[PDB]
Amino acid sequence: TQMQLVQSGTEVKKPGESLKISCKGSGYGFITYWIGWVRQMPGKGLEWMGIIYPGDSETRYSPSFQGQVTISADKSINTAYLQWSSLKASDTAIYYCAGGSGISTPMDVWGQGTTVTVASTKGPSVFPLAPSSGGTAALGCLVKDYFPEPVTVSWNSGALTSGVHTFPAVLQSSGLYSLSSVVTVPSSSLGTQTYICNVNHKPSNTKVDKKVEPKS
Amino acid sequence: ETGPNITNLCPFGEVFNATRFASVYAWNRKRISNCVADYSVLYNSASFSTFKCYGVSPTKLNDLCFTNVYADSFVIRGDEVRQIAPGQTGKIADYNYKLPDDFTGCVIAWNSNNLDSKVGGNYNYLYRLFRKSNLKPFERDISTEIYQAGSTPCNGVEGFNCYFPLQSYGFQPTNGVGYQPYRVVVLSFELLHAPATVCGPKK
Amino acid sequence: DIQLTQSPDSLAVSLGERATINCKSSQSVLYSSINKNYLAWYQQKPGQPPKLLIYWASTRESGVPDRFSGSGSGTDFTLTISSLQAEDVAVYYCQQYYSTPYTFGQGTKVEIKRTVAAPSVFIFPPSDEQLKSGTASVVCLLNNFYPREAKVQWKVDNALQSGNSQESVTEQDSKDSTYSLSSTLTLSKADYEKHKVYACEVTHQGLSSPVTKSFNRGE
Ligand SMILES: *[C@@H]1O[C@H](CO)[C@@H](O)[C@H](O)[C@H]1NC(C)=O
Ligand SMILES: *[C@@H]1O[C@H](CO)[C@@H](O)[C@H](O)[C@H]1NC(C)=O
**Burial bucket for residue A187 (CB in 10 Å: 0-12, 13-18, 19+):** middle
CA–CA–CA angle C138, C141, C147 (5° rounding): 140
What is the CA B73 to chain-centroid distance, rounded? Answer: 4
In this structure, which amino acid lies at residue C64?
Answer: V
What is the CA C205 to chain-centroid distance, rounded? Answer: 18
Secondary element (H or E) of residue B43: helix B40-43
Secondary structure class of C214 (helix, strand, coil): strand
Alpha-carbon distance of A183 to A165, in angstroms, equals: 6
Alpha-carbon distance of A110 to A118, in angstroms, equals: 23
- Would A4-118 and A125-212 be classified into the same CATH topology? yes
The answer on B196 and B134 residing in a single domain is: no
Query: Among candidates C147, C42, C143, B172, which has minimal Cα distance to A100?
Result: C42
Which residues lie with the beta carbon below 6 Å from any ligand 1 atom?
B 1-5
Spatial CB neighbours of A82, under 8 Å, sequence gap ≥ 6 = A20, A21, A23, A37, A49, A69, A70, A71, A95, A97
Alpha-carbon distance of A89 to A169, in angstroms, equals: 19
The full set of domain ranges for chain A reads 4-118, 125-212
Q: Cβ separation of A55 and B59 shorter than 8 Å?
A: no
Secondary element (H or E) of residue B40: helix B40-43
Beta bridge partners of C69: C80
**Set of chain A residues whose Cβ sits within 8 Å of the Cβ of B88:** none
In this structure, which amino acid lies at residue A173?
Answer: S
Alpha-carbon distance of B52 to B49, in angstroms, equals: 10
Across the interface, which of A105, A113, A180 has its CB nearest the CB of C97? A105
The answer on B159 and B67 residing in a single domain is: no
Q: Does A57 touch chain B (CB under 8 A)?
A: no
Radius of gyration of chain C (CA): 23
Fold assignment, C4-112:
Immunoglobulin-like (2.60.40)
CA atoms within 13 Å, Cβ hemisphere of B64: 16
Spatial CB neighbours of B46, under 8 Å, sequence gap ≥ 6 = none
In DSSP notation, C40-100 reads: EEEEE-TTS--EEEEETTTEEPTT--TTEEEEEETTEEEEEESS--GGG-EEEEEEE-SSS
The answer on B41 and B8 residing in a single domain is: yes
Shortest Cα distance, chain C CAs vs residue A158, angstroms: 19
CA–CA–CA angle A166, C49, B102 (5° rounding): 150
DSSP state, residue B27: -
The answer on B73 and B43 residing in a single domain is: yes
The counts of H helices and E strands in chain C are 2, 21
The full set of domain ranges for chain C reads 4-112, 120-216
The answer on B132 and B110 residing in a single domain is: no
Q: Does A182 touch chain C (CB under 8 A)?
A: yes
Enclosing domain of residue B160: 121-172
Alpha-carbon distance of C173 to B162, in angstroms, equals: 80
Which residues lie with the beta carbon below 6 Å from any ligand 2 atom?
B 12-13, 16-17, 41, 45
Query: Among candidates B149, B171, B170, B173, which has minimal Cα distance to B160?
Result: B149
**A125-212 is classed in which CATH architecture?**
Sandwich (2.60)
Across the interface, which of A96, A104, A113 has its CB nearest the CB of C99? A104
Residue nearest to atom 12 of ligand 2 (CA): B17
The answer on B67 and B6 residing in a single domain is: yes
Query: Among candidates A140, A187, A209, which has minimal Cα distance to C124?
Result: A140
Q: Cβ separation of C32 and B190 shorter than 8 Å?
A: no
Buried b (16+ CB within 10 A) or exposed e, B161-172: ebbebbeebebb
Shortest Cα distance, chain C CAs vs residue A29, angstroms: 19
Instruction: Tell me the CA–centroid distance for residue C140 and ligand 2, in Å.
Output: 71
β pairing state of A11-13 and A70-74: unpaired
In DSSP notation, B88-147 reads: --SHHHHHT----TT--EEEEEEE-TTTS--TT-B---EEE---SSPPPTT------PPE
CB–CB of C163/C187 below 8 Å?
no
Secondary element (H or E) of residue C190: helix C189-192
3-state secondary structure A8-49: CCCEEECCCCCEEEEEEEECCCHHHEEEEEEEECCCCCCEEE
What is the CA A184 to chain-centroid distance, rounded? Answer: 28
Nearest CA in chain C to A210: C129
Alpha-carbon distance of A99 to A65, in angstroms, equals: 19
DSSP state, residue C150: -
Total domain count, chain B: 2
Secondary element (H or E) of residue B198: strand B198-199
For the A4-118 domain, the top CATH level (class) is mainly beta
The CB-based long-range contact list for C51-55 (8 Å cut-off, 24+ gap) reads: C51/A110, C52/A106, C52/A107, C52/A108, C53/C79, C53/C92, C54/C79, C55/A106, C55/A108
Q: Cα–Cα distances in Å, from C140 out to A95, C126, C199?
A: 35, 11, 9
Q: Cβ separation of B53 and A55 shorter than 8 Å?
A: no
> To one decimal place, what's the resolution in Å?
2.4
Q: Cβ separation of A102 and B49 shorter than 8 Å?
A: no
Instruction: Tell me the CA–centroid distance for residue B142 and ligand 2, in Å.
Output: 30
Q: Cα–Cα distances in Å, from A183 out to A180, B165, C105?
A: 10, 83, 37
The answer on B153 and B68 residing in a single domain is: no
Fold assignment, C120-216:
Immunoglobulin-like (2.60.40)
CA–CA–CA angle C168, C172, C178 (5° rounding): 95
Alpha-carbon distance of B141 to B2, in angstroms, equals: 47
CB–CB of C59/C39 below 8 Å?
no
**Set of chain C residues whose Cβ sits within 8 Å of the Cβ of A51:** 100, 102
